Amino acid sequence: TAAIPDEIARQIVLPEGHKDNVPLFEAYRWLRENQPLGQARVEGYDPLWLITKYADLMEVERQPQIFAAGGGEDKGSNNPILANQAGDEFTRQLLGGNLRILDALPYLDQPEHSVVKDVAFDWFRPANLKKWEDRIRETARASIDRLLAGGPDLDAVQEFAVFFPLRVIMSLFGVPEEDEPRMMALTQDFFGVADPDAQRDDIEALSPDAAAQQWAATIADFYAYFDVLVESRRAEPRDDLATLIAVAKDENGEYFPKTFAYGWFVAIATAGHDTTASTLAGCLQSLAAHPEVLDRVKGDPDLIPDLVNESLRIVSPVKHFTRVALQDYEMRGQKIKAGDRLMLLFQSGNRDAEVFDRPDDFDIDRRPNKHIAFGYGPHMCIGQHLAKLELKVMLQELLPHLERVEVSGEPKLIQTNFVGGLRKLPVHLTFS
Numbered sequence: 001t002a003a004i005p006d007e008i009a010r011q012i013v014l015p016e017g018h019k020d021n022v023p024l025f026e027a028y029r030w031l032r033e034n035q036p037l038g039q040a041r042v043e044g045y046d047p048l049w050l051i052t053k054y055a056d057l058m059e060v061e062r063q064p065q066i067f068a069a070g071g072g073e074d075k076g077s078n079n080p081i082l083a084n085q086a087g088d089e090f091t092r093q094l095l096g097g098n099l100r101i102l103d104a105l106p107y108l109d110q111p112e113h114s115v116v117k118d119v120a121f122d123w124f125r126p127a128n129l130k131k132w133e134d135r136i137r138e139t140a141r142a143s144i145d146r147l148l149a150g151g152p153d154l155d156a157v158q159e160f161a162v163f164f165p166l167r168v169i170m171s172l173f174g175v176p177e178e179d180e181p182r183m184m185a186l187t188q189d190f191f192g193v194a195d196p197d198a199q200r201d202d203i204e205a206l207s208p209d210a211a212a213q214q215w216a217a218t219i220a221d222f223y224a225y226f227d228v229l230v231e232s233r234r235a236e237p238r239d240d241l242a243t244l245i246a247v248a249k250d251e252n253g254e255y256f257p258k259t260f261a262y263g264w265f266v267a268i269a270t271a272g273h274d275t276t277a278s279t280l281a282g283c284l285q286s287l288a289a290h291p292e293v294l295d296r297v298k299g300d301p302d303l304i305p306d307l308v309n310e311s312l313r314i315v316s317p318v319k320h321f322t323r324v325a326l327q328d329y330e331m332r333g334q335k336i337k338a339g340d341r342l343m344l345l346f347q348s349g350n351r352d353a354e355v356f357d358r359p360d361d362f363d364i365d366r367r368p369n370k371h372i373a374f375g376y377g378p379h380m381c382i383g384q385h386l387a388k389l390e391l392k393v394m395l396q397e398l399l400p401h402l403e404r405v406e407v408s409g410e411p412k413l414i415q416t417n418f419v420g421g422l423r424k425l426p427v428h429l430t431f432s
């Protein structure tokens with residue numbers, strides 16, 4: 001019944017707790033082993049049930065009529081992306097009483113979620129992505145040509161991994177190549193709201209609501225950019241993903257409001273590349289630690305999808321979304337009360353020893369690989385098949401050219417409790 005101990009709670013709730021993976025994963029492990037379903041009561045945050053167990057993540061996510069993302073019929077009464085209390089107060093001041101700062105899928109509950117998701121559901125199915133595989137492969141091969149030309153010593157993140165997924169999504173999306181640097185900068189602002197090295201110059205960095213102010217400022221910049229793109233594609237439809245979203249109409253023949261397009265565009269322009277970049281960089285870091293795995297996958301390229309799956313499980317770059325209980329609910333001997341918030345810890349589910357043998361080991365021979373890096377339930381990642389295709393294609397093209405990865409300097413993570421992973425991985429590569 002007791003609250004989670006304060007230092008374990010702070011490790012997971014506070015963005016600074018995520019600066020180093022070792023203490024963070026040890027806190028997730030302490031909970032799974034000693035307090036798998038407890039309430040974190042961190043000063044400055046709402047109380048949060050920390051959902052650390054794989055089975056519990058599925059139990060919550062498969063019951064959206066009980067555990068809402070956006071607050072159910074009181075739309076925007078829950079923030080699906082954990083802000084501190086001061087930050088939610090800033091957003092309620094800006095929006096006028098609620099937290100629905102994007103019309104993107106994470107903010108929506110059924111049935112609205114279902115209607116909006118159906119705009120793009122088919123586009124993102126694996127069979128409908130096959131038509132992009134050759135373009136993706138040409139993009140990978142161009143990126144690998146630049147890697148070979150630049151020599152063996154680089155930051156495998158900022159000087160390699162970041163560019164391929166960004167170019168892929170901007171090409172599919174229809175954003176011109178010259179706009180990639182702006183999209184990259186706004187993505188760093190968006191996922192860096194609590195990172196000391198990613199602060200915007202136009203917000204008060206030290207204010208209690210700084211992250212929320214940065215989130216809002218970044219969204220306003222994306223809206224200004226995507227307003228021009230929506231109007232452009234409505235006036236002159238093209239055969240690109242921007243057009244599918246920009247021209248989408250509801251069951252009465254009316255365009256969805258423009259902010260629904262903007263919400264798709266924010267999600268695709270941020271999570272659509274950053275997560276894949278993180279997983280690719282994390283894969284390279286794991287091949288440096290486990291050179292026998294690199295040798296084995298160069299020996300059998302059909303192991304590449306297994307390597308992608310184990311990279312996704314280990315890196316798990318999307319750390320959480322929040323839910324709110326719409327009714328009291330008993331789980332694992334605990335009484336969740338109506339109105340209580342939950343934090344879904346996908347990275348912790350991915351280390352649950354009840355599901356994975358030697359869960360901290362990098363083991364590509366987990367078949368099936370039961371990871372939950374894409375979440376579960378109706379909100380399960382829409383982009384998962386595009387991410388798996390891009391990582392497969394890049395590894396098919398890159399690994400033949402790599403004999404060895406060495407980490408030659410200190411890795412750096414984004415300091416975030418939300419969408420994290422490496423921002424720097426200094427390497428020495430041995431090529432062929």
Ligand code: HEM
Pocket residue numbers: 061105106107117169267268271272273275276279312316317318321346373374375376377378379380381382383384386387
């Ligand atoms: C390695 C790559 C990725 C990982 C690990 C990842 C992970 C996730 C996770 C854990 C969620 C939350 C699921 C839940 O609430 O149960 C999610 C949601 C989402 N992701 Fe992905 N993602 C990746 C790639 C992508 C890509 C490539 C796109 C788009 C092109 C994308 C778009 C989205 C969107 C729109 C949502 C919200 C879905 C909803 O709330 O219904 N993601 N992702």
Ligand SMILES: Cc1ccc(Cl)cc1
Pocket residue numbers: 102104106266267270271318419
């Ligand atoms: C993973 C993720 C999906 C959608 C948004 Cl808006 C942000 C992050």
